Structure formats: structure tokens, C-alpha cells
Write a protein that binds this ligand. Structure first.
Ligand code: NA
Length: 246
């Protein structure tokens, strides 16, 4: 399924780039109209919508709950939301606002015992494990908690195996070398991890540049294709992407 994605800083739809140390920097503003944008996506048939709340990522006290509530109320498919989700109270607040699935990032690497508790409390269908991956010179799929600078000492597979016994189901795997590049996604990466873990519903993220890039993912076993920039820049429509995917 095609999963259109929006990044939000204080009500504004933005493009961000990842920096050397993993931090996100703003590049350009697309506009102050997330609701009509999401509704355009939803109306065209998007099966899931992905939001990153960068304001809340910087300070969880400033989680954009009122905005998120209005966006969920405007659509009729699951909305998944990430952006520095670090405590169970943060997860609960998002779910209470009507978010379908909460995307969990670096906390799942740093504090696995804590996050295992979240799976027990919230259930596997409400949680998406985000894995930002950099494939190093040795072929290891490094999970980046700090971008390109330091090696986390944790692999994609190590983390997937960590959470399978508590029922892990959804994994968002971003290739950080392809994020925002319009290169095409890392097809062989997704072919490999999807076959390696048939019980996991993987979402691909990063690199989609044109309709052919969506076609290239069709046989991989990927269950969701996240598309940010190419939809925002009008390379193709959500309708066209769905017609291609199916
Ligand atoms: Na679809």
C-alpha cells in the first residue's frame, strides 16, 4: 500500500534534511495547509497516512496534539505519527487523539526493556518500530541513532529479533542514504529484509523519485511504501501511485 507522508513544524508542512549527527534541519516550507493536503491524499485513496511531528520531536511537551486531532478528524484511514516519541505517556496521548499507530524511534534502541512494556500495554498493532539504517562498508545494516558519525553497535536484525518475542509486526525501515534523494528506494535491501522476516510488515521509506520507483518495489514483499517529496513536488499523484502499486 502507498503511504503518503507529511513533516510538520508548528502547523507548517516542510521538507527537512538529515544532518551529520542525525538531527533534522528545515529546508523549505510547502505551506500552512496540512488538512487540505492530507484530504487530497485520503480522497485519492491512500490506505494509510504518515505524519512526523518535528515540533514534538524537539520538545514532547509541545506535541502538536490539537493539530493532530484535527487532521485525524478530517480523514477516514489509519494515521501513523512519529517524531521523538520517547515515553508511554507520549504514545498514549497520540492514541487518545485518534492516531492509529505510533512510530517509535531511538528509544527502542536505547531502552528496549521500556519499549517491550509498550508492546504489552498498547499491543503490536498500535506500534511501528522505525529503523533508520545505514549500510556500512562491511554490509552491516547499522541502526543509526546518531546519523553518519557514530556506529550504534546495533544492527537492523538485532533490533527486529529483540522485539519479535513481544509480537513486533510493523517496521518502518528508512535507508538514510536515500532519504529525500529521489534516487529510487534501496530495492535489494527491502527484498532481503522482507524475505528474511515474512512475519513482519515492512514499510519502505526514502528515495522514491518517480512512478517507476514504485513499480520496482512491487515484487519485494514490502507492505507499505512511504512517499514524501515526490508527492509534494508533484512527480506523480496518489492515484497514479496506487494504480501502479496494484
Ligand atoms: Na495502495
Amino acid at each position: 500500500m502507498i503511504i503518503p507522508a507529511l513533516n510538520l513544524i508548528g502547523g507548517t508542512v516542510v521538507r527537512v534534511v538529515r544532518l551529520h549527527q542525525g538531527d533534522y534541519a528545515r529546508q523549505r516550507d510547502y505551506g500552512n495547509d496540512p488538512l487540505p493536503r492530507l484530504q487530497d491524499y485520503a480522497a485519492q485513496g491512500a490506505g494509510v497516512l504518515h505524519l512526523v511531528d518535528l515540533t514534538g520531536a524537539k520538545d514532547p511537551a509541545k506535541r502538536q496534539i490539537p493539530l493532530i486531532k484535527t487532521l485525524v478528524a478530517g480523514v477516514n484511514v489509519p494515521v501513523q505519527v512519529g517524531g521523538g516519541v520517547r515515553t508511554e505517556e507520549d504514545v498514549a496521548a497520540l492514541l487518545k487523539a485518534g492516531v492509529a499507530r505510533v512510530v517509535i524511534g531511538s528509544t527502542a534502541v536505547k531502552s528496549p526493556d521500556v519499549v517491550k512494556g509498550w508492546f504489552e500495554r498498547f499491543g503490536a498493532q498500535a506500534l511501528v518500530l522505525a529503523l533508520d539504517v545505514r549500510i556500512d562498508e562491511h554490509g552491516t545494516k547499522q541502526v543509526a541513532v546518531s546519523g553518519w558519525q557514530e556506529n550504534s553497535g546495533v544492527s537492523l536484525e538485532q533490533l527486529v529479533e529483540t522485539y519479535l518475542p513481544v509480537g513486533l509486526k510493523h517496521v518502518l525501515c528508512t535507508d538514510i542514504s536515500r532519504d529525500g534523494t529521489l534516487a529510487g528506494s534501496n530495492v535489494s535491501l527491502y527484498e532481503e529484509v522482507c524475505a528474511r522476516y515474512p512475519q513482519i510488515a515492512f514499510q519502505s521509506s526514502g528515495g522514491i523519485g518517480d512512478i517507476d520507483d514504485i513499480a520496482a518495489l512491487r515484487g519485494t514483499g514490502v507492505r507499505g511504501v512511504i512517499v514524501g517529496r515526490a508527492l509534494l513536488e508533484g512527480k506523480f499523484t496518489v492515484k497514479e501511485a496506487i494504480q501502479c502499486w496494484q
